[PDB]
């Protein structure tokens, strides 16, 4: 229960709370809603055992820039707010400003918890379950672990899960030792090797100067790629000897190059791959976020899938030097390029592809909404494998983009996926 170090991503997150930087003054957070018919009381007791299982669900972030696992925490119960006597319009209004208030909520430093799991009773046996968590607490992969244990203790309250011997505190000790290794300097050397000729982020058409925004508010555009379409895209990705992540990232780059009138651009890629430092590392709750800056050359005479192969090659070379994290390389880019307090690489692709794996929270019910906020980010393209479907969620700073332009870019991204599903290739990019 000693305070221990933050990851370099966690540190960037904590410094993004300071409003003196542009597009800052908020903590990174994820929010979603599920319409469920499960027993909320059983869910609440199950969630309590998840909290005791995972120490990072009982941790706080301290102002001094460290984290600490608390000795004991108060019992957590899912608060139930009943709306069953309210007409549907009054229900919708209450949920709306409850949603907006949960998304604008900020978890105070040093206090517990960094999450909220609240239920709204719409009918006697129908609830709207809302879950939100600070990204200082856990990454998206860890969030799936929480849902997995949640459903396990829900169905089998007495079947106790195998004890964990590895903690995130142990991992952080290894993490701090990995910053000072020969592997670290080889990864560093690779990134300064690519630093003089590294392209800038896609220069999109912004509605105003980001310096004049103040605190950003995010909007989400979300769609579901059906099981049939996602299956065809996975089969086409394997036929062209490319990963689905490189494929979706290259489609992203095509839309970004078109709307930015650029040829070479840098995408901020967010992944959750964990270093294999212990047999149980894929079992613990924590932050394992890795940022890699993707050098991409879109405007080419090459066929689309030739560019996908280049994105694949670039991506794997990035992963073999991830020990030098993207926050450090980003700052290398700022100081080396004379670039002030601005947000440097604010176009983000967040891949939560599970490799035909289950999304545990989908067992709760039907997903109704998802929202994601991050400091110093203009646009975040989040793709989540959702039990055979692909959920695509674009989160952008509302004050920074015309809503119709954003909807147009989003629609063209989705339509290029449709093209690949039909013809196995894409057409010259034109307006939707």
Between CA 150 and CA 272 the distance in angstroms is 21
Regarding whether 187 and 159 lie in a shared domain, the answer is no
Among 156, 180, 204, identify where a domain stops.
180
Data resolution in angstroms: 2.3
Cα-based distances in Å from 215 to 67, 145, 173, 206, 347: 25, 31, 34, 16, 18
Which range of residues forms the domain containing residue 130? 1-180
Regarding whether 218 and 162 lie in a shared domain, the answer is no
How many other β-carbons are positioned within 10 Å of the β-carbon of residue 161?
A: 14
Regarding whether 174 and 186 lie in a shared domain, the answer is no
- In three-state form (DSSP H/G/I as H, E/B as E, the rest C), the secondary structure along the chain is CCCEECCHHHHHHHHCCCCCCCCCCCCCEEEEEEEECCCHHHHHHHHHHHHHHCHHHHEEEECCCEEEECCCCCCCCCEEEECCCCCHHHHHHHHHHHHHHHHHCCCCCCCCCCEEEEEEEEECCEEEEEEEEECCCCCHHHHHHHHHHHHHHHHCCCCCCCCCCCCHHHHHHHHHHHCCCHHHHHHHHHHHHCCCCCCCCCCCCCCCCHHHCCCCCEEEEEEEECHHHHHHHHHHHHHCCCCHHHHHHHHHHHHHHHHHCCCEEEEEEEECCCCCCCCCHHHCCCCCCEEEEEEEECCCCCCHHHHHHHHHHHHHHHHCCCCCCHHHHHHHHHHHCCCCCCCCCCEEEEEECCCCCCCHHHHCEEEEEEEEECCCCCEEEEEEEECCEEEEEEEEEHHHCCHHHHHHHHHHHHHHHHHHHHHCCCCCCCCC
What experimental approach yielded this model?
X-ray
Regarding whether 174 and 185 lie in a shared domain, the answer is no
The CATH code of the domain that includes 31 is 3.30.559.10
Between CA 114 and CA 108 the distance in angstroms is 8
Cα-based distances in Å from 400 to 227, 343, 405: 33, 13, 11
> Per the structure, how many domains does the chain have?
2
Regarding whether 427 and 376 lie in a shared domain, the answer is yes
Regarding whether 360 and 285 lie in a shared domain, the answer is yes
Q: Is the peptide bond before 113 cis (omega within 30 degrees of 0)?
A: yes
Regarding whether 253 and 161 lie in a shared domain, the answer is no
Among 180, 197, 216, identify where a domain stops.
180
């Amino acid at each position: 229960s000693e305070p221990f170090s933050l990851t370099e991503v966690q540190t960037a997150y904590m410094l993004g709370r300071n409003p003196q930087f542009e597009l800052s003054g908020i903590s990174p957070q994820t929010y979603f809603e599920y319409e469920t018919e499960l027993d909320i009381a059983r869910l609440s007791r199950s969630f309590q055992k998840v909290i005791q299982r995972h120490p990072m669900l009982r941790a706080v972030i301290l102002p001094e820039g460290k984290q600490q696992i608390l000795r004991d925490v108060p019992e957590y119960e899912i608060e139930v707010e009943s709306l069953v006597s309210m007409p549907p319009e009054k229900q919708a209004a209450r949920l709306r400003e409850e949603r907006s208030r949960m998304i604008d909520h900020v978890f105070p430093l040093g206090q517990w918890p960094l999450f909220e799991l609240k239920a709204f009773q719409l009918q006697e046996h129908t609830y709207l379950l809302c879950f939100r968590y600070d990204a200082l607490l856990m990454d998206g992969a860890s969030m799936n672990l929480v849902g997995q244990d949640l459903m396990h203790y829900y169905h089998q309250p007495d079947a106790q899960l195998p004890p964990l011997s590895f903690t995130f505190q142990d991992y952080m000790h290894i993490y701090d030792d990995m910053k000072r290794g020969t592997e670290y300097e080889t990864a560093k050397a690779y990134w300064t090797n690519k630093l003089p000729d590294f392209p800038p982020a896609p220069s999109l058409l912004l509605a105003k100067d980001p310096a004049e925004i103040g605190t950003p508010n995010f909007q989400s555009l979300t769609t579901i790629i059906t099981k049939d379409k996602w299956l065809k895209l996975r089969r086409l990705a394997q036929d062209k000897q490319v990963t689905p992540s490189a494929l979706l990232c290259t489609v992203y780059g095509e839309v970004l190059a078109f709307w930015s009138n650029q040829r070479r651009l840098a995408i901020n890629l967010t992944v959750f791959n964990r270093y294999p430092v212990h047999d149980e590392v894929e079992q613990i709750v924590g932050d394992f976020t890795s940022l890699i800056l993707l050098d991409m050359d879109m405007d080419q005479k090459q066929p689309f899938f030739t560019k996908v192969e280049q994105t694949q090659s670039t991506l794997l070379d990035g992963l073999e030097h991830r020990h030098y994290d993207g926050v450090e390389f980003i700052r290398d880019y700022t100081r080396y390029h004379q670039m002030r307090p601005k947000a440097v690489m604010p176009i983000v692709f967040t891949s939560m592809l599970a490799g035909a794996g289950a999304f545990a929270w989908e067992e709760i019910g039907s997903l109704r909404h998802i929202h994601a906020r991050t400091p110093q980010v203009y646009l975040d393209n989040v793709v989540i494998e959702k039990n055979g479907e692909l959920l695509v969620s674009w989160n952008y700073v509302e004050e920074l983009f015309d809503a119709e332009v954003m909807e147009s870019m989003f629609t063209q991204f989705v339509e290029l996926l449709d093209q690949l599903v039909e013809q196995g290739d894409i057409n010259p990019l034109r307006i939707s």
